[PDB]
Amino acid sequence: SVKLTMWIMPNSDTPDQDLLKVVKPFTDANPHITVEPTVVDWSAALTKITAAATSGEAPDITQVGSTWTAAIGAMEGALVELTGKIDTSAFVESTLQSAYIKGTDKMFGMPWFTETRALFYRKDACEKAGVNPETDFATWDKFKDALKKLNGIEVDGKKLAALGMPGKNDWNVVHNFSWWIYGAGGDFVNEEGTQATFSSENALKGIKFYSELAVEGLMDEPSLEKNTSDIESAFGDGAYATAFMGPWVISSYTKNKEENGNDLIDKIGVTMVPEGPAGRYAFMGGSNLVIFNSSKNKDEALELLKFFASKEAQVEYSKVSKMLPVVKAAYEDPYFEDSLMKVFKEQVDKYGKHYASVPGWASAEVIFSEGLSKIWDNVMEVDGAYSYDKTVQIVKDVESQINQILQETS
């Protein structure tokens, strides 16, 4: 018999058991294959995977952050090339980009699940404030006008901040700026993926618009010291009129109502991110699966990957992980078509934009995160008055470092 070993990151409440429940139909139907998952923490995962690819001491399969696929796939002899082995027509088209090395036709990962961030809002706050969510969040300028009407609005005796979002003490620093940069007509790197474009006029327009929401008082100031999970919890206890969050919060708030009677879930809606001057783009994240070239059972490894891309496994794993499926047929399930979830379905499909899938991306993201962290410090005036010129200098200094990374990894 064949024991497939698989590394996963912590995607659900009980990672190993939840994965094994989803694969039980596969191992029941293929009794000569067993699946042995091992959990690897997110912070050290890329380090451990890179070391396994280099040393040939690897599991058969590992989850990767979708942005890591090119980094690992570019390592000589690291991964099984999947080009032509997966039916790509099954996948939401926007999710496939991260599975390839950009500029090549080489597919080294299979998309597994995805996520995007949407704009959640308090319906009761909007009615009280005179905000119509069917129109007033559609564009940057309308959104900001709505925030002005919502900031400090009192609902059931509690004063709400207009927008709750984390600052630099967080793991989504870059991801939360991404769609502002895109909507302004900017990007982190050029289309070819070979030059940084983070200091363009358009990128700065997006960075300035989003970060100065803090200078203008429209963001909850205490929350800028906190992280994503804190903003999700606080919104779920009614602290903010709006917040940009992933789809997993719907389950959390639904559970809060079932267990504690917390009716926040009945007072919220969700809409797509506001369109910027250049159009509507949204963040895309998530994870892919890869097969190590050192695997002694690649045929069985591939069969497992294809199982994870089957409709039933996509539905079931997305439910338990609270992520979004990457296969089109999974969105036929009513779960992904309810009033809130359907906004996420539409956004990832029609407007999702993934970071360039280049081998240097993972290294570049750390640099972008450091720079945007300094921009938060700047707008929050932690060390002197806010200076937009300081943001410009930070972004130019980032641009230089990114170009050196791209030159090394070309």
Numbering used by the authors: 49 to 458
From the paper:
Clostridium thermocellum has extensive potential in lignocellulose biorefineries as an environmentally prominent, thermophilic, cellulolytic bacterium. Previously, five putative sugar transporters, denoted A to D and L and belonging to the ABC transport systems group, were identified in the genome of C. thermocellum, and the solute-binding lipoproteins (SBP) of these ABC transporters were shown to bind different dextrins by isothermal titration calorimetry (ITC) assays. To gain insight into the structural mechanism of the transporter specificities, 11 crystal structures, both alone and in complex with appropriate saccharides, were solved for all 5 putative sugar-binding proteins, thus providing detailed specific interactions between the proteins and the corresponding saccharides. Combined genetic, biophysical, and structural studies have provided solid evidence that transporter A and transporter B are the major glucose and cellodextrin transporters, respectively, among the five potential sugar transporters in C. thermocellum.
Similar to the typical SBP fold, all of the Cbps adopted two-domain structures connected by three hinge regions, with the buried ligand-binding site between the two domains. The unliganded CbpB structure and the complex structures of CbpB with cellodextrins (G2 to G5) were determined to 1.70 to 2.00 Å resolution. A hinge motion was observed between the unliganded CbpB and its complexed structures, and the rigid body rotation angle was ~17°. CbpB showed high affinities for all of the tested cellodextrins (G2 to G5), with the highest affinity for cellotetraose (KD = 0.562 μM). Surprisingly, the growth phenotypes of these mutants indicated that transporter B is the sole cellodextrin transporter, whereas transporter A is the sole glucose transporter.
